[PDB]
Design a protein around this ligand. Structure first.
Ligand SMILES: Cc1cc2nc3c(=O)[nH]c(=O)nc-3n(C[C@H](O)[C@H](O)[C@H](O)COP(=O)(O)O)c2cc1C
Ligand SMILES: Cc1cc2nc3c(=O)[nH]c(=O)nc-3n(C[C@H](O)[C@H](O)[C@H](O)COP(=O)(O)O)c2cc1C
Ligand SMILES: Cc1nnc2c3sccc3nc(N3Cc4ccccc4[C@@H](C)C3)n12
Ligand SMILES: Cc1nnc2c3sccc3nc(N3Cc4ccccc4[C@@H](C)C3)n12
Ligand SMILES: Cc1nnc2c3sccc3nc(N3Cc4ccccc4[C@@H](C)C3)n12
Ligand SMILES: Cc1nnc2c3sccc3nc(N3Cc4ccccc4[C@@H](C)C3)n12
Ligand SMILES: O=C(O)c1cc(=O)[nH]c(=O)[nH]1
Ligand SMILES: O=C(O)c1cc(=O)[nH]c(=O)[nH]1
Lengths: 379, 373
């Protein structure tokens, strides 16, 4: 790769520019710059063939590798192709809302490189469900003819507009608009930047929310020369819920009962935390903290929810995953698949290539024939 | 997407990223970002050969084409090769001083895209003559082994440290270090951002300064540059002088036997840019063009066409250039055109000027110098 050197995610120039943007350019602008490269398909891409021993699954959802991009990175779904070709097996676009939303005031993203941490208070900035659907549709039809993308998974994370009273109405609008094109739906009741939306994790309220979302998905069949499931699975999307790590033991057991009763297909553990207060540069800043100081939080949350749901609900891990050994901790804690965010910010384009390679060697060194043999083995 | 488009200065992606940085990223940061691409040789380049119909000269100094990069763009000379390969025939590094300086407080560069103007107050930030010299020597030694750069020109613009009393000593210190590697030296009495240094072009002092520089330069293969000859001596003038001061300075550069004059530096007389309300410094760009151009016609007249002119100020299009040349300039210098027009500026402006000279009946570019006149 002499001419192709510019498209290798590990090409040394990419971290020179990464270290520059981390040091000089506002975080949200660096994010927008990244999406601009993706939008015109001049992001580097991963040529590795993924190890068949490291694929994983949540029911009929078949991931070619265990790493995807967490929600909030391509909120509007404007360069799905490009980000996936970095080496990821799925992406969760969103969170989207019915009507487009400005978000909270700027700046709303701040970083601490020494500790590999992010704080943010974006407040569900997104273009709206109508526009994001059109973006996803255009990816789906490019997928119609592209063999390298035909097995990649796309989830959609849905939430409420800031000035909306009952969240069920807003989730319903999004499922009827975008549900037919998603391989799974993420219900976002975790976020800390929308006033009083983490109160929807009370067992009573969360139960009604899940049942509504399921009801609306099953009603899309008996509600209309067109393929109903315009996605990868070709089945109705699975329903996940993304949980906030700031709950006590009792709330966790109550939520576990609901996710068993309602027959949810998975849980995303976890969103950002408000409980970190030992980052000096985040002194006067507001919002939820992600990244390396979240890993131990998120992982112990995985073990409890794996235990409280009797290993019945598959887990998507999120929180402080940078290395292959970070990933193995999540998997051994109960997670079937992992989600990177702060790893892209601080490690850059190479994040999928590096972590897949590291985890492959780790699984062999620990004696696991494949990845599914490792799930929940620390228990 | 493929390399044969990513290294083309006219590839449309360069305007998408230009438009983005213009509206979202601090001006000095975009400049630093640009220099980073140059440092690692991932700027686009113009591989086309330049028409001999548009070559020019300042006495024995032969430019393959009439377009160069003004001072203050590669102050420290860290990607000379890369910038030249955009299509330019010379660049003027600097302005450098003996000892390095941070410069003034940040931010010190501001843009107004609508009017294509820049205001700045850097205050001669540079690494110092010692470090910059080392960078130029290494360009010269790579020039020794690349034929594609062997006819390109590199000037050096010289100034004084902010806290310095005798300017002659500091200009002398720079030539004794860097003069052997320069095709020409630019004496900076132009700038408005060094306290009371645009007042050092009073006829009394300015004469002693020029004689100082020439005396020190002549006291030095000796010449490791393109000329392979002693560097020629230029002066860059500030456009904010009255009629009386302009005729006096013209007398000196005739007496002192100067080789050329750079017209012009930035102006402080523009006050109708709404976005520059509370900002301080000198204004560049499109609103300086008419000013700098009339400055050329006066200086060409007061010097009886005896001293060639390097044009600088508000040059974006081929017809902007033809105005300068027809006014008395033998060569042109771009700054604000790179900021607002991006990687394509040398490619585009050369093509436009070539077509213009033909449409106007000019046998070559030198037939046009001072013809409006
Ligand atoms: C700037 C920013 C925006 C985010 N936006 C969303 C979002 O819209 N929906 C969501 O479910 N999570 C969002 N998240 C949380 C991430 O998806 C992820 O769960 C969290 O950052 C922890 O993972 P990490 O430590 O690997 O980055 C956001 C995080 C950040 C830093
Ligand atoms: C940010 C900035 C820094 C500059 N620094 C210098 C400098 O160090 N020395 C100098 O002679 N001119 C300097 N200039 C002036 C340019 O060389 C040029 O004369 C001026 O910008 C007018 O040309 P333009 O209209 O094409 O921009 C600087 C200009 C800008 C905008
Ligand atoms: C890496 C890399 N490798 N080759 C290239 C080439 S080739 C022509 C342009 C070009 N730009 C880059 N970047 C410059 C840049 C600037 C600002 C923010 C991010 C980046 C990264 C994405 C890549 N390149
Ligand atoms: C840097 C940086 N700082 N904040 C962020 C955020 S915030 C949400 C996403 C996001 N992405 C990044 N980049 C990852 C990356 C990788 C390689 C080269 C350049 C870059 C930058 C320009 C963008 N970010
Ligand atoms: C143009 C162009 N053509 N190919 C590429 C490629 S290929 C890999 C990276 C890459 N980056 C760019 N730019 C991205 C970018 C980002 C921020 C500021 C300026 C720029 C410009 C210089 C070029 N590219
Ligand atoms: C933008 C911008 N804004 N201020 C400046 C300044 S100030 C002194 C030099 C300078 N160079 C530029 N660029 C020209 C250019 C061309 C093509 C793609 C990107 C860019 C940017 C990143 C840098 N600048
Ligand atoms: O958009 C946001 O502000 C946001 C949403 C979310 O779910 N998590 C987060 O950290 N921020
Ligand atoms: O470096 C500067 O501040 C500067 C120098 C100069 O000559 N002209 C200008 O506008 N700024």
């Amino acid at each position: 790769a002499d001419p192709f050197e510019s498209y290798n995610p590990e090409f040394f120039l990419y971290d020179i520019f990464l270290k520059f943007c981390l040091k000089y350019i506002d975080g949200e602008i660096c994010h927008d710059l990244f999406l601009l490269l993706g939008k015109y398909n001049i992001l580097p891409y991963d040529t590795s063939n993924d190890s068949i021993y490291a694929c994983t699954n949540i029911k009929h959802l078949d991931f070619i590798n265990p790493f995807g991009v967490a929600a909030g990175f391509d909120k509007n779904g404007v360069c799905i192709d490009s980000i996936l070709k970095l080496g990821f097996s799925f992406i969760e676009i969103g969170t989207i809302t019915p009507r487009g939303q400005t978000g909270n005031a700027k700046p709303r993203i701040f970083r601490d490189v020494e500790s590999r941490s992010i704080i943010n208070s974006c407040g569900f900035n997104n273009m709206g469900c109508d526009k994001v659907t059109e973006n996803l549709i255009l990816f789906r039809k490019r997928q119609e003819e592209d063999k390298l993308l035909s097995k990649h998974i796309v989830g959609v994370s849905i939430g409420k507009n800031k000035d909306t009273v009952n969240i069920v109405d807003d989730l319903k609008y999004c499922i009827n608009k975008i549900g037919r094109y998603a391989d799974y739906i993420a219900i976002n009741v975790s976020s800390p930047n929308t006033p009083g939306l983490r109160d929807n994790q009370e067992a009573g309220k969360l139960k009604n929310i899940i049942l509504s979302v399921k009801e609306e998905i099953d009603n899309l069949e008996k509600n209309n020369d067109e393929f109903l499931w315009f996605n990868t699975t070709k089945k109705k999307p699975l329903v996940f819920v993304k949980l906030a790590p700031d709950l006590n033991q009792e709330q966790k057991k109550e939520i576990a009962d609901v996710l068993l009763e309602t027959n949810i297909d998975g849980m995303i553990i976890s969103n950002t935390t408000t409980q970190i207060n030992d980052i000096k540069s985040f002194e006067n800043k507001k919002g939820g903290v992600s990244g390396a100081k979240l890993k131990d939080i998120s992982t112990k949350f995985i073990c409890e929810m794996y235990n409280y749901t009797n290993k019945q609900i598959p887990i998507i891990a999120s929180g402080g995953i940078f290395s292959g050994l970070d990933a193995l901790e999540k998997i051994e804690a109960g997670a079937s698949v992992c989600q990177l965010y702060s790893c892209l910010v601080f490690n850059g384009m190479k994040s999928a290539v590096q972590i897949k390679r590291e985890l492959n060697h780790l699984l062999y060194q620990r004696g696991y024939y494949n990845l599914k043999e490792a799930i929940g083995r620390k228990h």
